[PDB]
Ligand binder design. Structure first.
Ligand SMILES: C=C[C@@H](NC(=O)[C@H](CS)NC(=O)CCC[C@H](N)C(=O)O)C(=O)O
Ligand SMILES: [Fe+2]
Length: 329
């Protein structure tokens, strides 16, 4: 009895090239989708998602409990006080089903200026032992750059969609400094499935993760072919169909801020499904000091009554608030 959300499939391949007219026609599609449900699938994106899913499966299914403590973020291992964002997010059998591995910009090395300054939200990635997970770090770091490239193209399309020059957002999205993250989330099959790991929405829907807006500029998401996401619209929560060949794209609340809610951050949630599956977001974050002056494409002079917000301020505030609201994940 739940209706299907409108989530168009947009061929984003022009965004990689030099046909300006064609890019405008993609931008229009992005504009339409962003004004409607706030979701679309990017197709013709060039990324080998089957291989991503296979490498990720090999990792999730071979990592051991020992390795998970050794990689754990601070919320699970108090010895790892520098790991707020990057590392392993453990399950809790009987209580919490989901588990995940998060990594940041591979350029955040020990000698990076923001790591030396101990700037919040910047960390040096932690990795399992190479001999236990051969090839994994190298694959994961290359994936970061492949999805970075897609995301830069997408950001060209959002900039054109909003009446700007194509580098309006991408000029703030740079390999040396982006705060973007990849999260490799495992949602398990469990028999029996612990009730304590199932939340219940006001409308009675069983959930794995409650309603929220994303903490991002845009989110660039690969998921297995198991339907699970729902978007709130004017006609209520609607099901977002799965497509394990595309990337699911939506705006996060930084985009809503910069656009004066012209491109809303859609409110969405994750249904509980008893199936072994993957959820692999790339959160498109800018640099710590990046500031985009807010504007309003519905107003003749483009002016907004919002104040400029630096991305770093936005991000550290947002991640903490999301944990408080919906739980440590
Ligand atoms: C995107 C779908 C996925 N949800 C998520 O990943 C949820 C909600 S968007 N996101 C988060 O909790 C933020 C993780 C941020 C990350 N640790 C970082 O430091 O950058 C899910 O399937 O649950
Ligand atoms: Fe989300």
């Amino acid at each position: 009895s739940v209706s299907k959300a409108n989530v168009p499939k947009i061929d984003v391949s022009p965004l990689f090239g030099d046909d300006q007219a064609a890019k405008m026609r993609v931008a229009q599609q992005i504009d339409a989708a962003s004004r409607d449900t706030g979701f679309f699938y990017a197709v013709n994106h060039g990324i080998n998602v089957q291989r991503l899913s296979q490498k990720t499966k090999e990792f999730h299914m071979s990592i051991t409990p020992e390795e998970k403590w050794d990689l754990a973020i601070r919320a699970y291992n108090k010895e790892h006080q520098d790991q707020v964002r990057a590392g392993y997010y453990l399950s809790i059998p009987g209580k919490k089903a989901v588990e995940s591995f998060c990594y940041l910009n591979p350029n955040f090395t020990p000698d990076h200026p923001r790591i030396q300054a101990k700037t919040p939200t910047h960390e040096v990635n932690v990795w399992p032992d190479e001999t236990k997970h051969p090839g994994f770090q190298d694959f994961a770091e290359q994936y970061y750059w492949d999805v970075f490239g897609l995301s830069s193209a997408l950001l060209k399309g959002y900039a054109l969609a909003l009446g700007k020059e194509e580098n309006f957002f991408a000029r703030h999205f740079k390999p040396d400094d982006t705060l973007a993250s990849v999260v490799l989330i495992r949602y398990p099959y469990l028999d029996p499935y612990p009730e304590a790991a199932i939340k219940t929405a006001a409308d009675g829907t069983k959930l794995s993760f409650e309603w929220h807006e994303d903490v991002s500029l845009i989110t660039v998401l690969y998921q297995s072919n198991v339907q699970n996401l729902q978007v709130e619209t004017a006609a209520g929560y609607q099901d977002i169909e799965a497509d394990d060949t595309g990337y699911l794209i939506n705006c996060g609340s930084y985009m809503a801020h910069l656009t004066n809610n012209y491109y809303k951050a859609p409110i969405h949630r994750v249904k509980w499904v008893n199936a072994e599956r993957q959820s692999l977001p790339f959160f498109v974050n800018l640099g710590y000091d990046s500031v985009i002056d807010p504007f309003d494409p519905r107003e003749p002079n483009g002016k907004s009554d919002r104040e400029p917000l630096s991305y770093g301020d936005y991000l550290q505030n947002g991640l903490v608030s999301l944990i408080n609201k919906n739980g440590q994940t």
